[PDB]
Amino acid sequence: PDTFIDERTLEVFSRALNPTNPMELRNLWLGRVEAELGDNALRPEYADLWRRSRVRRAVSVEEVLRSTATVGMVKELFNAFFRDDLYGALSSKRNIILSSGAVDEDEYGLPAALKETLRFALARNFYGYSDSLGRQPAREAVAAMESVSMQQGHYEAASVALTMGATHTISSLADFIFRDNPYADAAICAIPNYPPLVQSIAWRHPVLLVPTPSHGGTTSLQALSRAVTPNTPMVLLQTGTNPCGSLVDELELERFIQSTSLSTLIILDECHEWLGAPRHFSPARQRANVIRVSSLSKNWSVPGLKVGWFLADPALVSRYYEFASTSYGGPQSFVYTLVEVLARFERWIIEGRTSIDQQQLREFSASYGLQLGSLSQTYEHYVAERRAREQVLLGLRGEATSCLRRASMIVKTPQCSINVFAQIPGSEDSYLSFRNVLRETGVSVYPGILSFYLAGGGFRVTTARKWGDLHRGLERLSAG
């Protein structure tokens, strides 16, 4: 069963001088981890700090999940992991990085059809000022793409707002939602989640953390449904769960969505709902209080392009126009052609189209100068490249699951995305396991504490790497 918090987590919060301070909590958490590393402690200053700590209060489970310091402490550990541990003191060229959580851009990158649209925008000087919500033909293409996946209903361009990635989208949404929001109940964030997203929400409003366990690759929203109140301002939930790779059932999601008041905005993080997800969305996903956020960083492996959008009610998108104009002025006009081509190519794939006639070419404008022969060949090669990428990534995920289970390690079966969650038997600290595995085997893994797994010793393994690196990393994981 999934473990989210236990008595070991409460020990750090109980000995803190100031439990509200996120820096003191991070130092104690790092101090305890480095105390177990007797002769292998990287920073002995924190190890002595934990030794001198003394229990001075009683901490309950409810206190930890309702504290903004818990989100802050995890985010500080998130910061210390990258710039202080993985790419800082312990940075090495001989390390095998299995903790990135992103698809290898050099091996599995953007398709050549989509890279051609970026060179086309460069040649046409398509990098001027544009609308705050995005160019209108780009939004129209996105709406058509999202409509064919719905069981019933369609989407309009007034429901689409292009943004600069999912991290910026949710951060922008939280600031926009909590301007003068009358509802004073704590915002609900479902864990496991992404610390940058949770910390951004904790910036504006107090946050309640609700565990969302998974059983057999199925994400359970039973605990989430009970915690949601009629006065809840917002809810952040992943349809495809990270790091375990579990997936939310459509009927359970539909029942949970329909059981909430219209004043409770539901943010659906759909960045991991791919590579095995049956994307047949119920009409409840188009409810007035539902906001669907997606990004190109994982599915198309372009995190450095900062391209994304969200779907909401047309009245909400109209209000967001004023926020986007002031906050950043508008999205990237350089990638408007890429978004329009991506949305129309994906929509044709869902409809099962194999060849392109004059009807599909007429969807694009005449200013592009598209030809029937060139567009048809481009789309067919795009389909083959996307299907090939899906099969290789599925094979790597399955191969990693079997190889890592052969090393007598408890592994949860993934249902979507590119991540596999595993745990060495007898491990109780996820950050300590990262330090131990990196020192002995030389492979870096993503600790579960960075995924809001306050308890347990499981870690995330990213299987969407080059086969040469992935095989070597798995080989030393079994040997170690």
Ligand X SMILES: NC(=O)c1ccc[n+]([C@@H]2O[C@H](COP(=O)([O-])OP(=O)(O)OC[C@H]3O[C@@H](n4cnc5c(N)ncnc54)[C@H](O)[C@@H]3O)[C@@H](O)[C@H]2O)c1
DSSP 292: E
Q: Which amino acid appears at position 475 of this protein?
A: E
Segment lying near its own copies (by CB under 8 A), choices 125-133, 142-150, 213-221, 470-478: 125-133
- Of the candidate residues 38, 54, 93, 128, the single one contacting ligand X (CB under 6 A): 128
- Of the candidate residues 83, 279, 319, 381, the single one contacting ligand X (CB under 6 A): 83
Query: Contact 330/131 with Cβ under 8 angstroms?
Result: yes
Q: Does 447 help bind ligand X (rule: CB under 6 A)?
A: no
Q: How far is CA 193 from the centre of its chain?
A: 7
Q: Does 328 help bind its own copies (rule: CB under 8 A)?
A: yes
Q: How far is CA 157 from the centre of its chain?
A: 25
- Of the candidate residues 41, 90, 118, 370, the single one contacting its own copies (CB under 8 A): 118
Quick one: what does residue 328 bind among its own copies, ligand X, none, with the CB cut-off 5 to 8 Å set by partner type?
Answer: its own copies
- Of the candidate residues 159, 200, 282, 462, the single one contacting its own copies (CB under 8 A): 200
Q: Which is nearer to its own copies, 243 or 456 (CB)?
A: 243
Quick one: what does residue 164 bind among its own copies, ligand X, none, with the CB cut-off 5 to 8 Å set by partner type?
Answer: its own copies
Q: What distance in Å separates the CA atoms of residue 167 and residue 170, rounded to the nearest whole number?
A: 6
Q: Does 82 help bind ligand X (rule: CB under 6 A)?
A: yes
In the block, which residue shows the tokens 């130092």? Answer: 27
Q: Which is nearer to ligand X, 235 or 302 (CB)?
A: 302
Rounded to a whole number of angstroms, the minimum distance from the CB of residue 85 to its own copies is 15
CB neighbourhood size of 251 (10 A): 10
What are the Cα distances from residue 307, in Å, to 100, 169, 184? 19, 10, 32
Cis before residue 192, ω within 30 degrees of 0?
A: yes
Q: What distance in Å separates the CA atoms of residue 161 and residue 168, rounded to the nearest whole number?
A: 13
Q: Which is nearer to its own copies, 323 or 364 (CB)?
A: 323
What are the Cα distances from residue 311, in Å, to 25, 139, 146, 164, 291? 37, 10, 9, 14, 6
Q: Is 39 exposed, middle or buried (0-12, 13-18, 19+ CB in 10 A)?
A: exposed
Q: What distance in Å separates the CA atoms of residue 176 and residue 385, rounded to the nearest whole number?
A: 38
Binding mask 289-308 for its own copies (x = CB under 8 A): -------------xxxxx--
Q: Is 345 helix (H, G, I), strand (E, B) or coil?
A: helix
Q: Is 96 helix (H, G, I), strand (E, B) or coil?
A: strand
Query: Contact 474/405 with Cβ under 8 angstroms?
Result: no
Binding mask 135-174 for ligand X (x = CB under 6 A): x---------------------------------------
Q: Does 26 help bind its own copies (rule: CB under 8 A)?
A: no
Q: Does 333 help bind ligand X (rule: CB under 6 A)?
A: yes
Q: What distance in Å separates the CA atoms of residue 388 and residue 399, rounded to the nearest whole number?
A: 17
- Of the candidate residues 168, 344, 389, 412, the single one contacting its own copies (CB under 8 A): 168
Segment lying near its own copies (by CB under 8 A), choices 220-228, 317-325, 385-393, 408-416: 317-325
Quick one: what does residue 337 bind among its own copies, ligand X, none, with the CB cut-off 5 to 8 Å set by partner type?
Answer: ligand X
Residues making contact with ligand X (CB under 6 A)? 82-83, 87, 100-102, 105, 121, 126-131, 135, 304, 333, 336-337
Residues making contact with its own copies (CB under 8 A)? 75, 78-79, 83, 100, 102, 105-106, 109-110, 115, 118-119, 122, 125-131, 164-165, 167-168, 171, 175, 196, 199-200, 203, 302-306, 321-322, 325-329, 332-334
